[PDB]
Amino acid sequence: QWTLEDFDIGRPLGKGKFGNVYLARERQSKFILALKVLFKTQLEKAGVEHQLRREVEIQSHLRHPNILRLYGYFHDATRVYLILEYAPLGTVYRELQKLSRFDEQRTATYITELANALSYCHSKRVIHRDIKPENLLLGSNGELKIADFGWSVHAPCGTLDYLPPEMIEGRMHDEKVDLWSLGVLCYEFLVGMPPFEAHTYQETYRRISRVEFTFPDFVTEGARDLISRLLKHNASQRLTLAEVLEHPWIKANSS
Ligand SMILES: Cn1ncc2ncnc(NCCc3cnc(NC(=O)Nc4cccc(C(F)(F)F)c4)s3)c21
Numbered sequence: 001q002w003t004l005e006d007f008d009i010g011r012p013l014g015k016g017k018f019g020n021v022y023l024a025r026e027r028q029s030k031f032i033l034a035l036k037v038l039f040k041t042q043l044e045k046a047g048v049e050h051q052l053r054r055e056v057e058i059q060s061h062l063r064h065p066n067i068l069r070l071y072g073y074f075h076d077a078t079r080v081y082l083i084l085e086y087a088p089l090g091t092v093y094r095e096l097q098k099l100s101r102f103d104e105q106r107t108a109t110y111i112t113e114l115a116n117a118l119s120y121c122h123s124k125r126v127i128h129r130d131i132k133p134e135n136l137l138l139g140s141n142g143e144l145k146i147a148d149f150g151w152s153v154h155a156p157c158g159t160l161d162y163l164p165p166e167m168i169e170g171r172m173h174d175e176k177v178d179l180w181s182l183g184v185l186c187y188e189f190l191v192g193m194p195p196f197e198a199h200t201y202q203e204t205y206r207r208i209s210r211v212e213f214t215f216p217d218f219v220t221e222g223a224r225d226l227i228s229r230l231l232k233h234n235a236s237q238r239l240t241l242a243e244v245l246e247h248p249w250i251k252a253n254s255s
Pocket of ligand 1: 013018021034043048049053068084087090091147149150
């Protein structure tokens with residue numbers, strides 16, 4: 001039954017649309033964690049109070065080294081606080097801006113670690129639906145840790161960039177949506193920008209719908225194959241996580 005007075009609030013770890021993330025310390029144990037501060041008025045305004053309660057429920061069951069822990073939550077009067085595992089090496093979004101693009105060795109490792117986290121998620125029938133660089137964090141030893149199960153549902157906001165055709169059209173969708181997103185991620189890791197980037201929402205809609213993307217000259221055939229086999233309009237055709245993990249290019253470049 002946590003209260004704010006139990007925690008030493010430290011430095012900001014990031015700013016979000018719904019609230020801010022701060023580094024924190026549990027006064028008794030001296031344990032280092034992260035506290036995301038959400039406003040209650042903001043949550044009730046967009047009608048997502050149930051989604052947050054669903055996220056906490058989903059995260060109370062999941063345990064995996066490539067999934068950022070959510071320990072529980074508390075509120076006072078005006079704000080809601082999420083007790084979170086701290087990811088010392090920040091976001092992948094930030095690492096991507098810092099390095100422009102990743103090499104194949106780093107990319108494959110991230111895809112391998114993501115696939116594992118998704119494999120564990122999909123087996124428990126949990127679909128993430130929001131796989132993007134800003135929702136991927138890096139642990140002490142540089143491992144990928146997936147976070148933000150707010151838009152997660154059971155089997156079967158920002159830009160549209162990572163959302164599959166079935167999701168952007170407002171149709172039915174299963175575990176295969178995390179596979180399209182994984183494909184999109186793999187492309188942005190190597191290229192530096194997502195395959196369907198546009199200056200307008202409406203153009204991005206056209207690109208995703210018709211699956212209109214190209215590869216720059218530096219992308220290898222092994223990466224070209226993987227991404228192409230993932231980015232398919234037909235959800236039931238897309239490669240499985242097991243095939244992704246056993247993919248020649250993935251096996252070659254992964255650690
Ligand atoms: C930036 N950063 N740098 C280091 C670092 N280390 C640990 N954590 C960080 N950041 C927080 C990561 C999150 C994990 N889970 C989240 N969950 C969430 O934000 N849920 C959520 C929010 C608003 C609205 C809704 C609702 F209701 F709409 F569903 C749901 S955010 C870190």
